[PDB]
């Protein structure tokens, strides 16, 4: 198993037991009905375009679940991540074309679930399309949720994708509304969700500082009351602190002009175990 191997050094470079050539795509084309596309995207060599991967999957007529569609759009999303900033539109057109193929084919059995919509929202977050991710895909996922409950339920991954879209698009209030919708749905959020919420509160605090230097809520003294309580949500459920949590908390406290909380957080990072992450020294 490529994720949980029972041997060290899976591959080798010997003369007769050489197995790197047998790890490429095509040896796993023999069994595509039993295949896992997540490990196929992660562990394979010489993979084609994800549009051609979807063409080969639908050509073999295999019943793709939501995990397969999520893995193919995750492959397209990793292609969006690796490209330059000025070349993101064509890969997003490939993503929307693959999504259309996943919608309208209907034989072999292919269903679009919440993970596929979350991957499309993450694709629009990587491309930087607010009007395409929030207005089209998030609204379509919410319509599919409110139309057919008990089989299409929004998990934490979809709202993490929404918070990533609100951070990459700069939209502050929508991310706080999605975190409040996470809270009101009685499910715990991830740590990265609170990191994105602290980043959005930092953006709001910096905008309020620029607006008061130039001359929803125009009272800044309550905003820290809404900010530092996001730090209180880490000790609320379980939510262990990581490096990006310390980064977002120090950025939020620097946006709120409170250096004592930054000097407290830099000591709290050395308390249990946090690598101190030189941008933390910048803040």
């Amino acid at each position: 198993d490529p994720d949980r191997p029972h041997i060290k050094h899976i591959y080798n470079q010997t003369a007769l037991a050489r197995n790197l050539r047998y790890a490429r795509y095509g040896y796993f084309k023999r069994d595509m009905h039993l295949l896992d596309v997540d490990k196929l995207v992660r562990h394979a060599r010489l993979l084609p375009t994800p549009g051609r991967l979807l063409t080969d999957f639908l050509y073999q007529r295999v019943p793709l679940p939501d995990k397969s569609c999520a893995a193919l759009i995750r492959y397209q999303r990793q292609q969006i991540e690796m490209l330059e900033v000025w070349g993101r539109h064509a890969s997003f057109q490939c993503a929307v074309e693959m999504f259309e193929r996943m919608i309208v084919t209907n034989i072999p059995p292919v269903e679009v679930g919440v993970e596929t919509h979350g991957e499309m929202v993450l694709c629009a977050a990587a491309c930087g399309k607010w009007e395409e991710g929030w207005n089209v895909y998030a609204n379509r996922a919410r319509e599919l949720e409110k139309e057919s409950p008990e089989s299409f339920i929004l998990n934490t991954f979809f709202f993490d994708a929404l918070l990533t879209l609100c951070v990459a698009a700069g939209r502050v209030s929508e991310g706080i509304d999605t975190l409040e919708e996470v809270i009101k749905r009685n499910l715990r959020p991830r740590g990265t969700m609170l990191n994105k919420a602290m980043i959005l509160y930092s953006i709001l605090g910096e905008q309020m500082s620029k607006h008061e230097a130039s001359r929803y809520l125009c009272e800044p003294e309550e905003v820290e009351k809404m900010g530092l309580e996001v730090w209180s949500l880490f000790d609320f459920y379980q939510l262990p602190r990581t490096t990006a949590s310390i980064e977002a908390y120090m950025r939020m406290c620097c946006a709120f002009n409170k250096p004592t909380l930054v000097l407290k957080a830099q000591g709290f990072a050395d308390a249990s175990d946090i690598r101190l992450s030189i941008e933390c020294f910048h803040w």
Binding site: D31, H33, L34
Partner: peptide
């Protein structure tokens, strides 16, 4: 997680053919 039993059947069938190589011709 559901397609591991058929993969196990293919692997044990391949091991059975490797043991069939002991028979030689026919």
């Amino acid at each position: 997680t559901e397609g591991t039993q058929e993969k196990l059947a293919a692997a044990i069938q391949e091991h059975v053919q490797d043991a069939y190589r002991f028979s030689g011709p026919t």
